[PDB]
Each structure stands twice: as structure tokens, then as C-alpha cells.
Amino acid sequence: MVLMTKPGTSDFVWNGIPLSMELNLWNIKEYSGSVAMKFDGEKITFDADIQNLSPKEPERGVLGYPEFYYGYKPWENHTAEGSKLPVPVSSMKSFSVEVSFDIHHEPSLPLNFAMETWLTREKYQTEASIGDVEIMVWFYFNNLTPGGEKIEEFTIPFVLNGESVEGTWELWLAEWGWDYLAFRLKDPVKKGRVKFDVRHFLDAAGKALSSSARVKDFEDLYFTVWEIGTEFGSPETKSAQFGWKFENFSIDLEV
Numbered sequence: 001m002v003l004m005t006k007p008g009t010s011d012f013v014w015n016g017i018p019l020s021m022e023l024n025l026w027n028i029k030e031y032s033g034s035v036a037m038k039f040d041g042e043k044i045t046f047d048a049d050i051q052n053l054s055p056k057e058p059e060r061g062v063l064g065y066p067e068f069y070y071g072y073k074p075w076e077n078h079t080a081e082g083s084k085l086p087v088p089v090s091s092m093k094s095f096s097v098e099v100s101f102d103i104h105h106e107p108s109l110p111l112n113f114a115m116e117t118w119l120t121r122e123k124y125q126t127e128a129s130i131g132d133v134e135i136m137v138w139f140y141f142n143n144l145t146p147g148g149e150k151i152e153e154f155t156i157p158f159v160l161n162g163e164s165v166e167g168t169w170e171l172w173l174a175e176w177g178w179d180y181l182a183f184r185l186k187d188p189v190k191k192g193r194v195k196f197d198v199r200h201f202l203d204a205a206g207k208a209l210s211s212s213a214r215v216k217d218f219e220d221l222y223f224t225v226w227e228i229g230t231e232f233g234s235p236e237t238k239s240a241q242f243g244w245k246f247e248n249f250s251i252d253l254e255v
């Protein structure tokens with residue numbers, strides 16, 4: 001059903017779930033080489049062998065974020081048809097996400113396996129800005145650090161390979177053009193199956209930002225989307241070779 005070999009977006013449906021996949025190289029000015037993303041009905045795979053890389057904005061650190069998502073991504077003003085997102089955070093009872101993944105990459109490549117959402121003041125913004133929140137959940141990372149500084153750590157459960165684990169998550173916060181929160185699992189998992197509820201993270205982000213001058217009414221913000229992907233690169237990265245595979249995907253939003 002879906003095949004992309006250049007930056008772009010496409011909707012598709014997986015096990016009845018409407019989704020969008022983006023071959024996202026947002027911070028790459030130019031590159032040579034190959035990129036291929038594909039959805040075959042049963043799994044999503046991504047592969048990259050690119051060279052002559054240079055960032056558009058070196059200050060942003062990473063170079064790209066090939067991914068697929070459920071919902072409405074503000075920045076692209078896009079959503080596949082039939083999505084249940086966006087919804088106000090305060091209306092989320094639980095949001096269970098499950099996926100099996102396998103990531104491979106050249107050893108020195110700054111890379112991570114990250115999931116995130118954008119909490120916007122208004123339902124359908126086309127950007128995030130002061131008053132909004134970007135929240136990431138890193139299940140894996142390699143020669144990559146989240147932006148900002150570490151503030152606290154949280155113990156948050158998730159089911160690894162079918163076994164309930166009590167993960168230890170560092171929380172990184174930065175206040176740039178928007179509020180940035182990144183939950184980094186202290187024991188990265190490079191291949192496996194995870195199941196967890198986004199709500200726990202939301203609860204934690206809420207407490208962390210409870211004294212912010214910028215973010216005003218946390219529970220009132222719109223939970224717009226859930227992205228799943230891998231960020232890569234750094235301003236010094238000149239070439240990149242890595243790839244991944246996602247499978248056994250399923251979600252459950254309870255309003």
C-alpha cells in the first residue's frame with residue numbers, strides 16, 4: 001500500500017487504524033543518497049544511507065525524524081481521516097499505545113527511538129509557541145541527549161516484551177519557543193515490544209510544569225497527536241546509515 005523515497009507524507013490504515021507516515025527530514029538542508037519508507041499492510045520499515053548532510057538550522061541539533069503518527073500534527077496541518085485526536089488533555093482517561101520495534105544503526109550515529117505529542121492551546125494550530133508543550137518519550141537513544149537540562153526523574157511503568165516493568169525516566173525540560181519535555185528511559189531498549197499509557201506521562205508533565213509562567217492551564221490543552229519515530233543526527237553528522245521496523249501496533253484512547 002505505501003512507498004516513499006523522498007521527504008513527504010501519506011495516509012494509510014493499519015489494522016483499521018487511520019495513520020499518517022512522514023519521511024521527515026525537517027532539519028536537513030541537502031543530502032545525497034537514499035531514503036525509503038514503506039508500509040506493506042503488516043509493518044512499516046524505514047531505511048537510510050545518506051551522505052553530504054548539512055543542517056538547515058544547526059542550532060536545533062538533530063537532522064530528521066522519519067515517523068508515522070495517529071492524529072493531527074500541527075506543523076503539517078495534517079491528519080488522516082477518521083482520527084479521534086485532537087481532544088482536550090482533561091478528557092483523556094487513558095491512552096494505551098503498543099508497538100514492537102527493531103532499530104539498527106551505525107554505532108556512532110546520534111539517534112533515538114522517540115514518541116511525542118504536541119499540546120496546543122487551540123485545537124488546530126499550525127505551530128507550537130509560548131503556551132504550548134512538546135512532550136517526548138524516548139525508549140532508546142544512542143550518542144544523543146535531549147534538549148535543555150535534567151530536572152527530575154520519574155518511575156513510570158510500562159510492559160516490556162510482555163512483562164510489567166517499572167521504568168526509570170529522566171525528565172529534561174527546556175523553555176524555547178515552546179515548552180519542551182523529554183522523558184528518557186534510563187535503560188534504553190533497542191529492539192522489543194512495549195505497551196504503556198501516555199496518561200502517566202501527561203500526569204508527570206503536568207506536575208513538572210505546575211509552576212510555569214508560560215504554560216497556563218495544562219489540562220485544558222489539546223492532545224493533538226501521537227508520533228512514533230527515530231530522530232537522528234547532529235550538526236557534525238555528515239552521513240547517516242540506519243533503519244527500522246515497526247509492527248504489532250495498536251492504540252486505545254478512552255475519553
Ligand SMILES: OC[C@H]1O[C@@H](O[C@H]2[C@H](O)[C@@H](O)[C@H](O)O[C@@H]2CO)[C@H](O)[C@@H](O)[C@@H]1O
Binds near residue numbers: 062064075
Ligand atoms: O521546528 C519545527 C519542526 O519540529 C519538528 O519536531 C522536532 C522539534 O522541533 C524539536 O523540538 C524536537 O527536539 O524534535 C522534534 C522531532 O524531530 C517537527 O517534526 C517538524 O515537522 C517541524 O517542522
